[PDB]
Write a protein that holds these residues in place. Structure first.
Motif, PDB file in Angstrom:
ATOM      1  N   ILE A  48      25.196 -26.530 -12.223  1.00  0.00           N
ATOM      2  CA  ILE A  48      26.061 -25.363 -12.126  1.00  0.00           C
ATOM      3  C   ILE A  48      25.426 -24.177 -12.839  1.00  0.00           C
ATOM      4  O   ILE A  48      25.420 -23.052 -12.325  1.00  0.00           O
ATOM      5  CB  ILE A  48      27.449 -25.694 -12.686  1.00  0.00           C
ATOM      6  CG1 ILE A  48      28.145 -26.695 -11.766  1.00  0.00           C
ATOM      7  CG2 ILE A  48      28.283 -24.421 -12.849  1.00  0.00           C
ATOM      8  CD1 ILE A  48      29.511 -27.096 -12.260  1.00  0.00           C
ATOM      9  N   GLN A  49      24.864 -24.401 -14.021  1.00  0.00           N
ATOM     10  CA  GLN A  49      24.273 -23.276 -14.739  1.00  0.00           C
ATOM     11  C   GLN A  49      23.046 -22.755 -14.012  1.00  0.00           C
ATOM     12  O   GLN A  49      22.740 -21.567 -14.089  1.00  0.00           O
ATOM     13  CB  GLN A  49      23.933 -23.684 -16.170  1.00  0.00           C
ATOM     14  CG  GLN A  49      25.192 -23.808 -17.050  1.00  0.00           C
ATOM     15  CD  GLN A  49      24.943 -24.648 -18.298  1.00  0.00           C
ATOM     16  OE1 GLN A  49      23.803 -25.044 -18.574  1.00  0.00           O
ATOM     17  NE2 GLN A  49      26.008 -24.947 -19.041  1.00  0.00           N
ATOM     18  N   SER A  50      22.345 -23.620 -13.289  1.00  0.00           N
ATOM     19  CA  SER A  50      21.161 -23.176 -12.551  1.00  0.00           C
ATOM     20  C   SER A  50      21.530 -22.319 -11.364  1.00  0.00           C
ATOM     21  O   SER A  50      20.791 -21.391 -11.005  1.00  0.00           O
ATOM     22  CB  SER A  50      20.358 -24.386 -12.098  1.00  0.00           C
ATOM     23  OG  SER A  50      19.833 -25.006 -13.237  1.00  0.00           O
ATOM     24  N   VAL A  51      22.674 -22.599 -10.752  1.00  0.00           N
ATOM     25  CA  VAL A  51      23.175 -21.712  -9.720  1.00  0.00           C
ATOM     26  C   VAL A  51      23.504 -20.365 -10.330  1.00  0.00           C
ATOM     27  O   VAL A  51      23.098 -19.326  -9.811  1.00  0.00           O
ATOM     28  CB  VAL A  51      24.386 -22.339  -9.004  1.00  0.00           C
ATOM     29  CG1 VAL A  51      25.004 -21.312  -8.051  1.00  0.00           C
ATOM     30  CG2 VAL A  51      23.924 -23.639  -8.234  1.00  0.00           C
ATOM     31  N   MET A  52      24.223 -20.365 -11.454  1.00  0.00           N
ATOM     32  CA  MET A  52      24.641 -19.105 -12.065  1.00  0.00           C
ATOM     33  C   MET A  52      23.451 -18.240 -12.460  1.00  0.00           C
ATOM     34  O   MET A  52      23.521 -17.001 -12.418  1.00  0.00           O
ATOM     35  CB  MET A  52      25.486 -19.385 -13.314  1.00  0.00           C
ATOM     36  CG  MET A  52      26.783 -20.115 -13.080  1.00  0.00           C
ATOM     37  SD  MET A  52      27.575 -20.478 -14.653  1.00  0.00           S
ATOM     38  CE  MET A  52      29.180 -21.027 -14.083  1.00  0.00           C
ATOM     39  N   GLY A  53      22.360 -18.866 -12.871  1.00  0.00           N
ATOM     40  CA  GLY A  53      21.201 -18.114 -13.314  1.00  0.00           C
ATOM     41  C   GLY A  53      20.383 -17.488 -12.197  1.00  0.00           C
ATOM     42  O   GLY A  53      19.705 -16.486 -12.427  1.00  0.00           O
TER      43      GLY A  53
END
Length: 140
Positions: A48-53
């Motif tokens: 999820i954090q990799s999508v956000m980044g």
């Protein structure tokens, strides 16, 4: 952090997802795909954090790619999770269509129906260089 996150259905889009990664890296983009850059820790949070980044969200729509999202209203499917994150973060979403038929909106959970409003790129086996060039134009 990466310019591009590649979301894909493991059982049907893994080869195309990999091919997109190579081409985008050859054209200078920093790319996240799970098998190269997902490392240690709790993978739900990491993905999820990799999508956000990532500024761009490339969605590989191979045949049946959204089937496991259907009736996934508890959002346990990872592709569903990745799409909802991309939508709710206002990412530049770039669907790549490869033998995929767009569902009717009402068969998908409401939190990802908006994925159907984005302009997609048809993957051409015969004109791959031209397809890649269009993808690059879509990237921000």
């Amino acid at each position: 952090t990466p310019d591009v996150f590649i979301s894909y259905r493991r059982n049907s889009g893994s080869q195309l997802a990999s091919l997109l990664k190579v081409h985008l890296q050859l054209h200078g983009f920093s790319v996240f795909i799970d098998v190269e850059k997902l490392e240690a820790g709790k993978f739900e949070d990491k993905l999820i954090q990799s999508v956000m980044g990532a500024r761009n969200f490339v969605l590989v729509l191979s045949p049946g790619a959204l089937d496991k999202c259907m009736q996934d209203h508890d959002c346990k499917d990872w592709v569903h999770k990745e799409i909802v994150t991309a939508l709710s973060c206002g990412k530049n979403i770039v669907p790549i269509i490869d033998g995929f038929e767009w569902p009717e909106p009402q068969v998908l959970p409401e939190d990802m129906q908006a994925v159907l409003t984005f302009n997609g790129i048809k993957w051409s086996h015969e004109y791959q260089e031209a397809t890649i060039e269009k993808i690059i134009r879509f990237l921000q």
